[PDB]
Short mmCIF file of C-alpha atoms (C1' of nucleotides) and ligand atoms in Angstrom, two decimals:
data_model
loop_
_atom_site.label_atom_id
_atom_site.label_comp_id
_atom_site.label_asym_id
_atom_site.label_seq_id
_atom_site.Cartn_x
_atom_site.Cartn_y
_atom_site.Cartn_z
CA UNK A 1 11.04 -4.45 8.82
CA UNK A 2 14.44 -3.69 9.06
CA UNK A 3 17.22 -2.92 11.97
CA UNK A 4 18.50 0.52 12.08
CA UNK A 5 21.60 1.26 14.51
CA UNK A 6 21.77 4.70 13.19
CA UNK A 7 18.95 6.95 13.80
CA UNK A 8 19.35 9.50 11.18
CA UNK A 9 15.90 10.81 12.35
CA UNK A 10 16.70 11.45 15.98
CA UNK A 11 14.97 14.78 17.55
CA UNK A 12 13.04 14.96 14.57
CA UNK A 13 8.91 15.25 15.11
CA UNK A 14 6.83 13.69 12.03
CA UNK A 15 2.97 13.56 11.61
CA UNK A 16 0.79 10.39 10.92
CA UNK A 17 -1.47 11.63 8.18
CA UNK A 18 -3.87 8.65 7.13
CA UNK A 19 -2.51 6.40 9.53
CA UNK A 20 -4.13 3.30 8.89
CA UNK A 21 -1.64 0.84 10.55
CA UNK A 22 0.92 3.46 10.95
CA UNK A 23 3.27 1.78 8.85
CA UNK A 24 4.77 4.93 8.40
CA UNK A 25 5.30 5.36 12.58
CA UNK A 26 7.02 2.21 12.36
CA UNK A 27 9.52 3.76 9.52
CA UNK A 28 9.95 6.68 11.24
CA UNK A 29 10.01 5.57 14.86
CA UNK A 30 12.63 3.18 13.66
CA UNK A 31 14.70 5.86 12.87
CA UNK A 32 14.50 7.91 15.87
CA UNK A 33 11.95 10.22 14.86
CA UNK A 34 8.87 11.41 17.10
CA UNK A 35 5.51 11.14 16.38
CA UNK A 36 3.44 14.04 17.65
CA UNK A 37 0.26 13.55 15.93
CA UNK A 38 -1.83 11.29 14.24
CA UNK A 39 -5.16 11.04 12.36
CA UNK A 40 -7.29 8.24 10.70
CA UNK A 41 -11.11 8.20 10.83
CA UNK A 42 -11.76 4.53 10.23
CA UNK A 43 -13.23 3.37 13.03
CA UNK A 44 -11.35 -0.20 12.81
CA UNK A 45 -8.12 1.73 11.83
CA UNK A 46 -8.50 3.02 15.26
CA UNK A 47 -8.49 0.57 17.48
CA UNK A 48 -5.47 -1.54 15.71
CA UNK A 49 -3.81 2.15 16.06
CA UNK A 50 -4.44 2.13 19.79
CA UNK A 51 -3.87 -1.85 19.90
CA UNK A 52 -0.60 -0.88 19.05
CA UNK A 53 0.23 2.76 19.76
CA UNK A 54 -1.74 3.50 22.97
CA UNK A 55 -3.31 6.49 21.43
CA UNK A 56 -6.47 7.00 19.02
CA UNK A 57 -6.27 9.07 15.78
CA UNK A 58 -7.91 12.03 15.43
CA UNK A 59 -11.41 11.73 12.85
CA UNK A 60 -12.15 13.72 9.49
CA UNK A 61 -9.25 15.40 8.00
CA UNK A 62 -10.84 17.71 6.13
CA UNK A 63 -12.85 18.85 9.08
CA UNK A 64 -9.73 19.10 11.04
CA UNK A 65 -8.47 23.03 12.03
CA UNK A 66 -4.69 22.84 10.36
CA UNK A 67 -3.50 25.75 13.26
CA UNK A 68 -4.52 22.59 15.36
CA UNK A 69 -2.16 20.35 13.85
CA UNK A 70 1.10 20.47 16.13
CA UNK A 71 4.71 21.63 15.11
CA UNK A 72 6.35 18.77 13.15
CA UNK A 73 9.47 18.23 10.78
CA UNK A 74 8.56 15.97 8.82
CA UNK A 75 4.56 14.95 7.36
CA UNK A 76 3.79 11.74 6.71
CA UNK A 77 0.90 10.61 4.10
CA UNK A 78 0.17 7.59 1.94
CA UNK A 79 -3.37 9.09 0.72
CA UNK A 80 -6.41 7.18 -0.29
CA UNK A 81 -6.11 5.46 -3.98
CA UNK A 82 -9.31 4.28 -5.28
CA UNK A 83 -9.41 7.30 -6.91
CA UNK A 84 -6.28 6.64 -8.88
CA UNK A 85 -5.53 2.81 -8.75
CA UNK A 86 -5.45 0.78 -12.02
CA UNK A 87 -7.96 -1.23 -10.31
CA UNK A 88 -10.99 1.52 -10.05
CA UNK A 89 -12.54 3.69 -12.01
CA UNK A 90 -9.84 6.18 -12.01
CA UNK A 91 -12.00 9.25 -11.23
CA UNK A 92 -8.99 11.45 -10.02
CA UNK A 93 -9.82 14.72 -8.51
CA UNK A 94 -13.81 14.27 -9.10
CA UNK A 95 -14.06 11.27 -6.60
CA UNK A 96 -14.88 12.46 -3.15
CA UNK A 97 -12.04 10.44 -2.03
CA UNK A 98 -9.74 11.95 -4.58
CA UNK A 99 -9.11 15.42 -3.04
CA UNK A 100 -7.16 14.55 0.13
CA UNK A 101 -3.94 15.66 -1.21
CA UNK A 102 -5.38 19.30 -1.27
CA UNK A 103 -6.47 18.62 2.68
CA UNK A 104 -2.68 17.82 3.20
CA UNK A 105 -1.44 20.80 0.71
CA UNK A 106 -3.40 23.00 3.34
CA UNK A 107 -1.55 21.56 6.22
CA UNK A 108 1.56 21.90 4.48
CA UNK A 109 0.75 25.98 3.88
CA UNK A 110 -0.09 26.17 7.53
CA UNK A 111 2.61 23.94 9.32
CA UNK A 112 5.19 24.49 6.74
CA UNK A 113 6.88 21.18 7.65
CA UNK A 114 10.84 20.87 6.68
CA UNK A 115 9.62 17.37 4.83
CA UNK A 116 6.87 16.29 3.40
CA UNK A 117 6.62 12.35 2.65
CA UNK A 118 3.57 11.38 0.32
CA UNK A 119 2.74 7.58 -0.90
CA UNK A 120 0.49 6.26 -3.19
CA UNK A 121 -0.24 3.48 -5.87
CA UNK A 122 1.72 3.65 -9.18
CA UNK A 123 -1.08 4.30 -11.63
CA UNK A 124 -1.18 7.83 -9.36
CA UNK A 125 1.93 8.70 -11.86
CA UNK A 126 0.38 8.53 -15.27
CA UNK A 127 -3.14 8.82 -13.90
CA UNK A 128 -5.07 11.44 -16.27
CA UNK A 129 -1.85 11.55 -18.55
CA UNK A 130 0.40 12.35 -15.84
CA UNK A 131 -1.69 15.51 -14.87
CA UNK A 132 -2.43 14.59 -11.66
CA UNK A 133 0.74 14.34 -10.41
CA UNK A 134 1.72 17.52 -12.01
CA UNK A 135 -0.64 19.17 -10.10
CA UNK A 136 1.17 17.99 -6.77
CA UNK A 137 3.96 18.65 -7.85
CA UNK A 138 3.48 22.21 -9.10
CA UNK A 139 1.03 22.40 -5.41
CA UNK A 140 4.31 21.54 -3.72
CA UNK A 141 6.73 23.58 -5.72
CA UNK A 142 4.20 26.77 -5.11
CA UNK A 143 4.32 25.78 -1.32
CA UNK A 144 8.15 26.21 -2.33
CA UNK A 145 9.21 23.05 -2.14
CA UNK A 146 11.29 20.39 -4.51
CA UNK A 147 9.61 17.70 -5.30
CA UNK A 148 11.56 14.20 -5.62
CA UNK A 149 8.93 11.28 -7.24
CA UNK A 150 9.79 7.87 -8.01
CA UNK A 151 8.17 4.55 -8.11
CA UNK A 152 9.90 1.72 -6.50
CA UNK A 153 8.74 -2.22 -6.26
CA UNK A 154 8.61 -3.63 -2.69
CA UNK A 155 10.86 -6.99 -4.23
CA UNK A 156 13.50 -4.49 -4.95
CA UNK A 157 14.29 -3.80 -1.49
CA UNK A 158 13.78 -7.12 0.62
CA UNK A 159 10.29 -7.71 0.50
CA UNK A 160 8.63 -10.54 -1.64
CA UNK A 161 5.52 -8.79 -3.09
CA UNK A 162 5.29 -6.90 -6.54
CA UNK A 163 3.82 -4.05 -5.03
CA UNK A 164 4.77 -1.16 -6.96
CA UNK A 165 4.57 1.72 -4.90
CA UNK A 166 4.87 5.90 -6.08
CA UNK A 167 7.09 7.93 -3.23
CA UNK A 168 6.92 12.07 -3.19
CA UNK A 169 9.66 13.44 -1.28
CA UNK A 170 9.21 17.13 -0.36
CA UNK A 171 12.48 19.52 0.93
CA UNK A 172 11.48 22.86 2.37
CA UNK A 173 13.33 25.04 -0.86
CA UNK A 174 15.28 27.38 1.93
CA UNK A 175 17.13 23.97 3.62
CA UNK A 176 19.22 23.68 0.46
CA UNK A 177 19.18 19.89 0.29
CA UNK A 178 20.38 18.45 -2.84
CA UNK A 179 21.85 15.26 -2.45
CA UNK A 180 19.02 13.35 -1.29
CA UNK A 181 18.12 9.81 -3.47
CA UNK A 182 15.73 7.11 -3.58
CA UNK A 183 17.23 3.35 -1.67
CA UNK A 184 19.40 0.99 -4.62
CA UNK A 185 17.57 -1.85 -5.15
CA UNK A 186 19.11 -4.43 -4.03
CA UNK A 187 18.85 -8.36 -5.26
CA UNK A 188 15.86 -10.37 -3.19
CA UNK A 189 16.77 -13.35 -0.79
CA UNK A 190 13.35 -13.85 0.52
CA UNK A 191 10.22 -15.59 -1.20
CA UNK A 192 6.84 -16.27 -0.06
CA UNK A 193 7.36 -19.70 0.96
CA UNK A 194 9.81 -18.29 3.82
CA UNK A 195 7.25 -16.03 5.11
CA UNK A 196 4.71 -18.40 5.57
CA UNK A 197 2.95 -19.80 8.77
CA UNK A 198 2.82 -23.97 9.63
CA UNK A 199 0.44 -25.89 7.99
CA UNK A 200 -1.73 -26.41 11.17
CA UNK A 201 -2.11 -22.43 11.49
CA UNK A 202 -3.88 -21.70 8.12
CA UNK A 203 -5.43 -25.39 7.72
CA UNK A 204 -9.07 -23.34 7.45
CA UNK A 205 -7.82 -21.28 5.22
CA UNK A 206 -7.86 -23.89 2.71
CA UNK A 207 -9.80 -23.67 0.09
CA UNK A 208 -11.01 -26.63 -2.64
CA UNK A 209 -12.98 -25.74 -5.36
CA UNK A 210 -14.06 -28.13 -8.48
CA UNK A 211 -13.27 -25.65 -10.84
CA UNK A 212 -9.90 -25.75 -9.97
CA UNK A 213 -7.62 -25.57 -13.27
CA UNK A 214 -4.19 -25.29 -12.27
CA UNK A 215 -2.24 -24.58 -15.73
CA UNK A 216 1.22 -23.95 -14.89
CA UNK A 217 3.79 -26.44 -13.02
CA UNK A 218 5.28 -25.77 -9.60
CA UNK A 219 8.56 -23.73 -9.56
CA UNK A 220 11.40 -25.20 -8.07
CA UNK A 221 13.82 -22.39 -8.37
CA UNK A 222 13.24 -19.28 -6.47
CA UNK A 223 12.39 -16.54 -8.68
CA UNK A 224 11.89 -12.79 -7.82
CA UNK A 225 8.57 -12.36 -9.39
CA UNK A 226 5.15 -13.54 -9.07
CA UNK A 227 4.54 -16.88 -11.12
CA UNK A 228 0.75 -17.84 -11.54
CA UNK A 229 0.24 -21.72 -10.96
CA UNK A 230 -3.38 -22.11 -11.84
CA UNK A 231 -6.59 -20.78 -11.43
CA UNK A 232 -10.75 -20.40 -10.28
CA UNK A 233 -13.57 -19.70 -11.54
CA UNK A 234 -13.08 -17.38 -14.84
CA UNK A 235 -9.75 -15.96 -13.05
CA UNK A 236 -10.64 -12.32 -11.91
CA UNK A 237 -8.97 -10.65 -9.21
CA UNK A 238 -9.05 -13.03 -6.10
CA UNK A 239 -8.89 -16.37 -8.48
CA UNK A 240 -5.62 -16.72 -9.36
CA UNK A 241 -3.30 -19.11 -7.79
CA UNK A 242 0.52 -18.43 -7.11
CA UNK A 243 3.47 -20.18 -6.42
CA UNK A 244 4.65 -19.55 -2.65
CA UNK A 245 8.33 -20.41 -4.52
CA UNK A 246 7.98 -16.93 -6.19
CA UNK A 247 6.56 -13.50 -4.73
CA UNK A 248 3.62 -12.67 -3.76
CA UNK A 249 0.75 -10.19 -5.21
CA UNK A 250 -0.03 -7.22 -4.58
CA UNK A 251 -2.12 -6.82 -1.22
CA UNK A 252 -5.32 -5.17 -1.54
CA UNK A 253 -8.37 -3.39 0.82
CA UNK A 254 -11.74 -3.94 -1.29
CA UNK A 255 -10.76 -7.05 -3.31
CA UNK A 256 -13.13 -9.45 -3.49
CA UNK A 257 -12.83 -13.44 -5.18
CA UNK A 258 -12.70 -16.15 -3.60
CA UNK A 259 -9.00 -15.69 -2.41
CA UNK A 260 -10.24 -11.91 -1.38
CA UNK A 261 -7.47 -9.06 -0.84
CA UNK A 262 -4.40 -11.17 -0.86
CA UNK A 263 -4.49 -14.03 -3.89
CA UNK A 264 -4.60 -17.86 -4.08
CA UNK A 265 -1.51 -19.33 -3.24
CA UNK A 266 -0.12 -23.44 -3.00
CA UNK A 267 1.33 -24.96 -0.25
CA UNK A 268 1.65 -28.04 0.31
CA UNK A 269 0.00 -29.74 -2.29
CA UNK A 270 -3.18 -27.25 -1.10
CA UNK A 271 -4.76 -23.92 -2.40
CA UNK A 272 -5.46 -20.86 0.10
CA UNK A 273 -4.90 -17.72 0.84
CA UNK A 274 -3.22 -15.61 2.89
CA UNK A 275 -3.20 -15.46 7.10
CA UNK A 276 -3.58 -11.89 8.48
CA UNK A 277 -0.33 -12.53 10.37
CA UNK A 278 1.64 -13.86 6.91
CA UNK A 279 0.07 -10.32 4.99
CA UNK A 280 1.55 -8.58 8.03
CA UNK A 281 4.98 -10.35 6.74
CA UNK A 282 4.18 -9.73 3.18
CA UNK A 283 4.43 -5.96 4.04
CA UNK A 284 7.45 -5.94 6.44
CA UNK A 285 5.47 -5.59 9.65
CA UNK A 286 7.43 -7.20 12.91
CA UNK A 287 5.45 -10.10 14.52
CA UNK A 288 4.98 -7.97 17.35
CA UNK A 289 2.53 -5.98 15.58
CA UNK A 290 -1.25 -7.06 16.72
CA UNK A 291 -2.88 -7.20 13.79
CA UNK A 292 -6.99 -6.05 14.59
CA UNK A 293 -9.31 -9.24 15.71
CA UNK A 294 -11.75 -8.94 12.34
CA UNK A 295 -10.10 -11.15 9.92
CA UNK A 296 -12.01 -9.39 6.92
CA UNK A 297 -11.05 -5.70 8.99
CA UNK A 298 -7.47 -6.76 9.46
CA UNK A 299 -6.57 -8.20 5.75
CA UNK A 300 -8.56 -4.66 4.66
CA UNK A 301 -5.50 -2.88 6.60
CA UNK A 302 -2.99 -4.84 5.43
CA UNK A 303 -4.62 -4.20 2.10
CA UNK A 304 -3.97 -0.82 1.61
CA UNK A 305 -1.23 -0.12 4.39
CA UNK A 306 2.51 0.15 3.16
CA UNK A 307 5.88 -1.77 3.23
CA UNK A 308 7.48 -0.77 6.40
CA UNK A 309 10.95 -1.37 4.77
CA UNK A 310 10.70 0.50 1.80
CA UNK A 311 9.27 3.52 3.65
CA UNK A 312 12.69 2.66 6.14
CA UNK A 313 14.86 3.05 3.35
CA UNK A 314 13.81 6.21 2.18
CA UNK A 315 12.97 8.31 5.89
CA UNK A 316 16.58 7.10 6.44
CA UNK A 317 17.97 8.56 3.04
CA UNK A 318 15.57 11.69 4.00
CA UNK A 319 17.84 11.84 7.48
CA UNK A 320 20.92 11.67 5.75
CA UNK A 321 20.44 14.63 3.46
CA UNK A 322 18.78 16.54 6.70
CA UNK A 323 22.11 15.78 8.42
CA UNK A 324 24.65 16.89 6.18
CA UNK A 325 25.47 20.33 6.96
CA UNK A 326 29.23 21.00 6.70
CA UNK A 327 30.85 24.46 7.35
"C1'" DG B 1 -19.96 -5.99 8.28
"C1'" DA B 2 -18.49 -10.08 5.69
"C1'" DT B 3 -18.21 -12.44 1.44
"C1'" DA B 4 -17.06 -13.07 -3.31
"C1'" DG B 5 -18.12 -12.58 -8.89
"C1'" DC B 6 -16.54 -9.38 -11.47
"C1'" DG B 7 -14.88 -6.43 -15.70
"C1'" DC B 8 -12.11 -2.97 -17.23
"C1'" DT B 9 -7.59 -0.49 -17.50
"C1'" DA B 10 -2.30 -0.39 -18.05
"C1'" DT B 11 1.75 -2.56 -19.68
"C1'" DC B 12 5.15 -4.38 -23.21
"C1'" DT C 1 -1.07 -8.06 -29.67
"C1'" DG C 2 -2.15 -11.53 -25.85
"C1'" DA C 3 -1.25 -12.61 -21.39
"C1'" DT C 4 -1.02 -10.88 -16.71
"C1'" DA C 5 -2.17 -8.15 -12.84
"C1'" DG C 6 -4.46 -4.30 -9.90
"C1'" DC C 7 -4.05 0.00 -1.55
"C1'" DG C 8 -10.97 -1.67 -6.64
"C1'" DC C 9 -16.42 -2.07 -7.37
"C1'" DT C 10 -20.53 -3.38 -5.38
"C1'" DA C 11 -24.55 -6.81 -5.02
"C1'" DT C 12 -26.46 -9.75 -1.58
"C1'" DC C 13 -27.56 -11.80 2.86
N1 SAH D 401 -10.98 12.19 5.70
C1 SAH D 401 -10.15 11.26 6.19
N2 SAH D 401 -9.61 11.39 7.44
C2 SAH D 401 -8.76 10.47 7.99
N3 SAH D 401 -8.36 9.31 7.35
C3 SAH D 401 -8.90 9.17 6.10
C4 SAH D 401 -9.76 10.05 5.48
N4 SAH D 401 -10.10 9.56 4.19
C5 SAH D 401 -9.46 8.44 4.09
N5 SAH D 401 -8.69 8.10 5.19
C6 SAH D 401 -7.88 7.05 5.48
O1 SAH D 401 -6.84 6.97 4.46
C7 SAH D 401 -6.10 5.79 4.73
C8 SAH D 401 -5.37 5.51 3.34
S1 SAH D 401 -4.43 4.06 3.47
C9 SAH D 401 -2.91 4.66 4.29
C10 SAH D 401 -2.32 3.51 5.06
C11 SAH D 401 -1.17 3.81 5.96
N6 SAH D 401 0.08 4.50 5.40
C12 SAH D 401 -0.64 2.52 6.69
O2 SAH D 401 0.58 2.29 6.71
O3 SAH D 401 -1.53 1.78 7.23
C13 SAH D 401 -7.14 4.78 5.14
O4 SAH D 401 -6.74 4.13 6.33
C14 SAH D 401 -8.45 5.65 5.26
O5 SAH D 401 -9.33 5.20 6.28
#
DNA sequence: GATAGCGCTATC
DNA sequence: TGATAGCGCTATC
């Protein structure tokens, strides 16, 4: 994550829908904001909350009384996606786990926040021809709200990982905020191989399998983009090996293969994959972050958690437009 | 819970 | 296209 001498967000109170790692307390907290609630119902999620934020989140949103929530200025929510990612079966609204945003449209009626900050994957903005993302946005305009959607890619802004991410930024319609815009990119200085942990530290997770075809030559020029060195097995998800000289892949919470939720990587001369503590780096968390002690738990939240930088850019853009007020 | 083979979709 | 990539799916122990 990034520094942040001004706190655009100071005296401001935000909500920690969907927690997770609270990737987006780190964003906000960064930039003086308060965080006054929280919720996540993972069990694991939990205790890596509370590992790192002294409090537990509060279970089943959609069991949850909204008049309960407290005041806030700002919700926070990077909803579930294996409803909408290009990797599932892109159900949409008619997967159980695909009507969350509704939970959060309620507690958006009820709190009436002055911001509401949404994330999700990109496939979320063409999902079901783009209908599914009209819905939110009329929801949110009918909650009276504008609606500001864009997707950026984490190796835009600082982070080596072609994550491509979807951001909704909501303005309460009566604050008349209208010059509020998405972070520049800006070019990347920083590749994999910088982010990585000594040799000694991820020795086990080498891996060295016979049907290991590598088909592409080393890079020796850093690139901003992902560049695939070789490959397992017939090359599905979890199978494909990078270059460390490049970015990384996109993180992931179910993925499976051999090099499960984070990709195959060389190093060294060696194939492996991914420490818990190097995804942490992959997605902008600060090594003082404790990642949970279940390797397969931890990499899950890593998986589907969020770059803290990114979401820094943008709750500091959303302070800035909050702040200007001239006579 | 942890592990890992997969198989289809979106993109240009 | 044809090649690459995806906060995923899910069977098995
Ligand atoms: N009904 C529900 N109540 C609370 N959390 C829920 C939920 N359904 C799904 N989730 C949670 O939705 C989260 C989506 S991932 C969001 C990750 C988060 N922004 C971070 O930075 O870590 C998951 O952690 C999942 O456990």
């Amino acid at each position: 994550m990034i520094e942040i001498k001004d706190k655009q967000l100071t005296g401001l109170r935000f909500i920690d829908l969907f927690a997770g790692l609270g990737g987006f307390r780190l964003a906000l907290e960064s930039c003086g904001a308060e965080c006054v609630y929280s919720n996540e119902w993972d069990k694991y999620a939990q205790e890596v909350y509370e590992m790192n934020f002294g409090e537990k989140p509060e279970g089943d949103i959609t069991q949850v009384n909204e008049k309960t929530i407290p005041d806030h200025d700002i919700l926070c929510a990077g909803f579930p996606c294996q409803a909408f990612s290009i990797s599932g079966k892109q159900k949409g609204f008619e997967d159980s786990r695909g009507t969350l945003f509704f939970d959060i449209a309620r507690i958006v009626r009820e709190k009436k926040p002055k911001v509401v900050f949404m994330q999700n994957v990109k496939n979320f903005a063409s999902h079901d021809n783009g209908n599914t993302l009209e819905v939110v946005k009329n929801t949110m305009n009918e909650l009276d709200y504008s609606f500001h959607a864009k997707v950026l890619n984490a190796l835009d802004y600082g982070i080596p990982q072609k994550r491509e991410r979807i951001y909704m930024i909501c303005f309460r319609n009566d604050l008349n905020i209208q010059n509020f815009q998405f972070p520049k990119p800006f070019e990347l200085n920083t590749f994999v191989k910088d982010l990585l942990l000594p040799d000694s530290e991820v020795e086990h997770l080498v891996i060295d399998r016979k049907d290991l075809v590598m088909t592409n030559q080393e890079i020796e020029q850093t690139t901003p983009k992902t560049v695939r060195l070789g490959i397992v097995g017939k090359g599905g998800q979890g199978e494909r090996i990078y270059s460390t000289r490049g970015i990384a892949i996109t993180l992931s919470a179910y993925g499976g293969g051999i090099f499960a939720k984070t990709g195959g990587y060389l190093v060294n001369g060696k194939t492996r994959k991914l420490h818990p503590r190097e995804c942490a780096r992959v997605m902008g968390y600060p090594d003082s972050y404790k990642v949970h002690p279940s390797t397969s738990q931890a990499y899950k939240q890593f998986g589907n958690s969020v770059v803290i930088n990114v979401l820094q850019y943008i709750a500091y853009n959303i302070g800035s437009s909050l702040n200007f007020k001239p006579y």
